[PDB]
Amino acid sequence: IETPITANFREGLNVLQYFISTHGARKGLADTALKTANSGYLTRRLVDVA
Amino acid sequence: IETINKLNRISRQMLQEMGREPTPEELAERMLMPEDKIRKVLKIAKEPISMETPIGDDEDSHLGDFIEDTTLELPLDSA
Amino acid sequence: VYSYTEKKRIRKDFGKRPQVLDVPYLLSIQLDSFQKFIEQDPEGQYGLEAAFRSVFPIQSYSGNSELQYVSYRLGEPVFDVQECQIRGVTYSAPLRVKLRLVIYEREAPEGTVKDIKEQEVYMGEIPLMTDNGTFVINGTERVIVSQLHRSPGVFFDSDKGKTHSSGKVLYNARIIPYRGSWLDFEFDPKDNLFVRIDRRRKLPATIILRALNYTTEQILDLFFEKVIFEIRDNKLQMELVPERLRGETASFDIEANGKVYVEKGRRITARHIRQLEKDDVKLIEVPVEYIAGKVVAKDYIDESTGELICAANMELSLDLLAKLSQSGHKRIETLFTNDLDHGPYISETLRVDPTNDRLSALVEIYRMMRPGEPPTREAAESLFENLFFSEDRYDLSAVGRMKFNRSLLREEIEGSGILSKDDIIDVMKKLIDIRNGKGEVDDIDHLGNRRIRSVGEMAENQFRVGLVRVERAVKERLSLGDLDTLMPQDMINAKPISAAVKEFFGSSQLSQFMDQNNPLSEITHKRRISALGPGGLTRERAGFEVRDVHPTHYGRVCPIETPEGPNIGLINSLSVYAQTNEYGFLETPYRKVTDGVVTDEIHYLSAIEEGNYVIAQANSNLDEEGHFVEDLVTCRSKGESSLFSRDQVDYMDVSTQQVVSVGASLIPFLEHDDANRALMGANMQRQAVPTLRADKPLVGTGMERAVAVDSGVTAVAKRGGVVQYVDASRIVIKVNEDEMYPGEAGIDIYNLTKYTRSNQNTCINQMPCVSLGEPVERGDVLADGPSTDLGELALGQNMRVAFMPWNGYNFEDSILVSERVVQEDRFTTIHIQELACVSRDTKLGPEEITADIPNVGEAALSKLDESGIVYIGAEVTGGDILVGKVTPKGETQLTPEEKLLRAIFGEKASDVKDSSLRVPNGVSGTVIDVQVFTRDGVEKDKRALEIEEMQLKQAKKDLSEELQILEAGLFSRIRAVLVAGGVEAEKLDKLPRDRWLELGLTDEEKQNQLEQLAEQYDELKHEFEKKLEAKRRKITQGDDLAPGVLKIVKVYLAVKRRIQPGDKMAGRHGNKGVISKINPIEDMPYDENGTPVDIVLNPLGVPSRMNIGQILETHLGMAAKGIGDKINAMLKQQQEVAKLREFIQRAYDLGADVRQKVDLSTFSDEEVMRLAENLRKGMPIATPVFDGAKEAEIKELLKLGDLPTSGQIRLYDGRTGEQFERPVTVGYMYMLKLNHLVDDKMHARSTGSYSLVTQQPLGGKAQFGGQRFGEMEVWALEAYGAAYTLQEMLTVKSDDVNGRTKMYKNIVDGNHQMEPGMPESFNVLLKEIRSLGINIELEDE
RNA sequence: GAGU
């Protein structure tokens, strides 16, 4: 996004800014879940070979 | 089998007359059979439910993951 | 001015913008939708109505009989809420429907007066909804979750890149019905349009049009715009419209009129185009060179011989041109295909499709759908017809039709359900528009593209399916049986009705156990919205697409409330002010702004509507009842934010809190907290448990009143008046004549419920708030639910926390806490746990409940009555016997040694197992109550008889009280009536009370009201006396148990569970932790003042987690209590009313920028000192979300608390007396104890029950199960060289019977030798392989 | 509904 968040958590963000950040947040947490099963599976494959 | 058939045909009528359910006594009345016999048939009426039945609403368990063998005298008692 | 409860407790609100719209009823969705299902509205198509008329009236196949539906009546449900909860019944009402059989004649015309028989049949029971918006299913509280799904209509998607090294731009149209098989039109690599019906296989789209009744040339009309080609002499002319050229390099010298216009090769510009247009060109000379390569439209025959030459969609070559002009047709219809705008599409489709007529299209259709079934003509026709044009199979609904019609630019709202062929063609028209570049691609994810299914709409759905099965049975029976003699009630069975309904209610995904940990949990659950369910996605089926955060979610769903893990993205809470529109689409209320000035009008807009207009945020600064303060203002249009000037601005947000859900709205300084921790915060709040002692939160938002209000577990005054009687069980209020009905009596009775069991095993108790003789208003809080203070949400309790590192007791988010917490009994849970004792009947003999228990300590016998029932109020422990039970045994397996001893010592073995009801492991509390349900067959138990007699006299006493309380109201009213126009208080007072029916005064209003109230006595009397009979039909009746079960006893354990180390605690900010150690008061640091600390939280939990709002809460929290400090002091110091008033008001009016101005003045002395007492405990403030208290105003208040503005204080270590070298942040924060109790989390197993097939240890604390040592753990052992440990886990610890028993004995004997056997799992393996006919032998050496 |  072109315009960033100039403010800090000290000031507190508003409607818009906080909303903006949610995208990345949710994306991040969904990654921590669903994108880790790939790595687990990968590892098990390594295990079995070795 | 034929007795079971009677049961369920009558069940419909009785639910509609009462506005609710048929108690064994009331049912037993209309059939002119002994309540004990009715209750027996009600129990025997249960069909095989699967041992492999996913008990887990979340595919956790195939009913089997509950069942314990009471035949086994416990290692406590074997000692 | 304010109500009596607000006058009792104000919370200071730091809100800067004034909330114009009041917070909507939060449970509305549920209430109103369920209402729609049963709503008696004849013309209105809702629930029952809609379902019935859709199939009804059911006309006979033979045609000479018919079944008609008149109207229905809902019986008042036979089982009350309480009663169904008691017996484990589903709470429902009878539906009875008035139906008519009407019979025609054969021979005589169709004379409709042959046989007319009509009556009311019972159509089954309908599960009913509670006052709370909840449902009683098998005697447990369930909620039906709202369901998002993709709306019926048209979806136009692009596969961006997708497949191919090209990355072919390939589009698709998906046709979604409410009910019916699906249509897909998609683009092959070489641009040929393929159809997937029921998205099955890819056929040419043209085949579908063929089936639709279209000729090759008809399709080329409605798709391609023809070009007129004349042949004159040897030369060739086209009828050409000037605009057609448009962007086109010239191949010839184009001689129009006279002059050369287009140079051969020069790209045609707009100049050339307008020039020719104004010249008035019909015909233009062209070379025979141009047409070789074009296409021929119609199938022009050679009239002479009759011979066909150019076909429908054929390529043009030099020689055929000669043949055509030779056949003698003056006018030729070559095709328009330049690419660019109108490309080679329909043309190409027709070529790949070798099929021709309607019939062969229907054949290939049928052969894709049923490959291998012989193409009988009528079967194919019926298939295709029934696929899209069957009324019964295919319904798009107003939903589907409205969205469909909006995408294809139609004014018309409501459609005919079935696929009209215009629609179909329009579809392909718009797809191939987009392929040219005319349409936009739609996003599935648009809120306007996703519909929300509430209660009534879902119920209607599944109910309609019940009616479908009804049609198969009913209509079938309408034809066979002899019509005359047969009556309507014979035909109709309620079974499948109630089955399908109870299917939905019980078995469905959306119907779940309500979370009642606290009122927040319930309220939030009710309005949460899931993307799963029928017509919806599962976990694998959900990619990034719908999970990710859409700009449309603004003011509709909280972007910030969702379960972490695989559920994430799928389930989301409804935002605060948000509701469902007419079509179940999400909408948000917004303020109008007319010509610069901000009006007061609110309009609800859907997502689609929202895209259109330019909206200012709530945060934007507003000139007092005029315009906007800044010239260049902050707003968003068409989904995109930035700067606008005043005049351009159309609308505005009502308040900030509309962005966020209910849960998120409760968090105070969300503004300073990162979203990750925000998410966790909302989640934890949902798991907070009510303690013994409710405390109002120091730092709220203003929403804490609303939340409690809507939760509805609190009891609220529905008229207002004065409290006549106050009981910790009964609150009776005398209404003012204001709200008083001239019909009934004016006394309102609220019976409270104390200590009932929640689904979570938690506490549900009501405390009365107000006092006897208090005057209160409509909507005052009479009695509080569990986690509720005088109006306010009291989720948890607030403690003095000190942010500092301790000697590793606060290590990594771990918590240090004071013994003082237990001293005060804060954070002590009441858990009401339920156990059931079942006396079944085996053929081994019927089990019985008696005090008779072979080889038990008389310690265990002593607490039991003669019935074998635990005494009321006795406190017991895990392992202790509650209810005695005996079961049929059968021994006789005396192995040699046993017989010997039986002979010697005697002890004659009485056959009986120890079925008697044990208490759970490590659990100890008090029996709060006991219940007994005896089946009708066997006779009454001693204990049962006496307790059902207890309940008897209960009903009596309560009912007598009821009658007399309302009678007191009636009688009181008559005296107020008889004294107004007949001055007699001597004569009346001392005459008996029941002798006033005979009375008769002045005749007008006086007399009419008197008769109203007298007939109320007659009614009350006959009402009550049957009201009694009702409980006496219910209590007397033998209780209905499942087959095989003789009797049952429910027992409630009351455990007072004290906080300990390992319990789970958190704040609202996502900061959480386990109790590591409880320190004696002495250990904890203390103030200069001598006040010792309560909790010590690790500061290192702050910075990387990025929730700073908890710091803000801590500071504001100390100052809130600083307020309480000073006030408490002036209360102890008595002093004068005036001075207290001064301090208090100057406190409230602290903010230079505050909205809420509470100028005290007018308040009476009573109310003043009363208020002081309440704020003695520390003044409760309201920072609302985003619109909250700034740091400077907090600093300002810290001066009024006479405490450091930095909020840090120097602390003395209670152990050593040494000060900490620097000051630390101290202050009050609002803490909560979770539903996660270490008590439950403790579990261990040595030996117990094993698994049936594998013979491995079972799972769970429920079976005394062992942990799985998984392949992961295996790997660990393997990394070490630890072979024997591993082997233990594999054999002696699990499936090796001989091995585990032998090793057990070895351990006792002090051997510790292993000696392994063969694990049973491996044998399982062998046998299953041999079942598959695969030989596996283990080879000897 | 927990945590990694």
Swiss-Prot record, chain A:
From the record, give the cysteines joined by S-S bonds: none
Source organism superkingdom = Bacteria
Reported function: DNA-dependent RNA polymerase catalyzes the transcription of DNA into RNA using the four ribonucleoside triphosphates as substrates.
* Assembly, per entry: The RNAP catalytic core consists of 2 alpha, 1 beta, 1 beta' and 1 omega subunit. When a sigma factor is associated with the core the holoenzyme is formed, which can initiate transcription.
The Swiss-Prot or TrEMBL record describes its family as follows:
Belongs to the RNA polymerase beta' chain family.
The molecule here is called DNA-directed RNA polymerase subunit beta'
What is the source species?
Escherichia coli O139:H28 (strain E24377A / ETEC)
What gene is this protein translated from?
A: rpoC
Q: Which residues of the full protein are shown?
A: 755 to 804 of 1407
Curated annotation (Swiss-Prot), chain B:
- How is the quaternary structure described? Interacts transiently with the RNA polymerase catalytic core formed by RpoA, RpoB, RpoC and RpoZ (2 alpha, 1 beta, 1 beta' and 1 omega subunit) to form the RNA polymerase holoenzyme that can initiate transcription. Identified in a complex containing RpoD, the RNA polymerase subunits RpoA, RpoB and RpoZ, CRP and DNA. Interacts with Rsd; this prevents interaction with the RNA polymerase catalytic core and with promoter DNA, and as a consequence, promotes transcription from promoters that require alternative sigma factors.
Q: What is known of its domains?
A: Contains 4 domains, connected by flexible linkers. In the active conformation, the domains are in an extended conformation, each making extensive interactions with the RNA polymerase catalytic core.
Family label: Belongs to the sigma-70 factor family. RpoD/SigA subfamily.
**Portion held of the full protein:** 457 to 535 of 613
Cellular location(s): Cytoplasm
Task: Describe the task this protein carries out.
Answer: Sigma factors are initiation factors that promote the attachment of RNA polymerase to specific initiation sites and are then released. This sigma factor is the primary sigma factor during exponential growth. Preferentially transcribes genes associated with fast growth, such as ribosomal operons, other protein-synthesis related genes, rRNA- and tRNA-encoding genes and prfB.
Domain of life of the source: Bacteria
Stretches for region Sigma-70 factor domain-3 = 2-78
This chain belongs to which protein, by name? RNA polymerase sigma factor RpoD
Which gene does this sequence derive from? rpoD
Annotated source species: Escherichia coli (strain K12)
Curated annotation (Swiss-Prot), chain C:
Indicate whether Transferase appears among the record's keywords.
yes
Q: Which domain of life is it from?
A: Bacteria
UniProt feature coiled coil, ranges = none
Q: Which GO terms describe its molecular function?
A: DNA binding; DNA-directed RNA polymerase activity; ribonucleoside binding
Question: Which positions carry N6-acetyllysine?
Answer: K1021, K1199
The protein's matches in PROSITE patterns, at most eight in alphabetical order, are given as: RNA_POL_BETA
Q: What does this protein do?
A: DNA-dependent RNA polymerase catalyzes the transcription of DNA into RNA using the four ribonucleoside triphosphates as substrates.
Q: Which NCBIfam families match?
A: PRK00405.1, rpoB
Put simply, this protein is called: DNA-directed RNA polymerase subunit beta
Source organism per entry reads Escherichia coli O139:H28 (strain E24377A / ETEC)
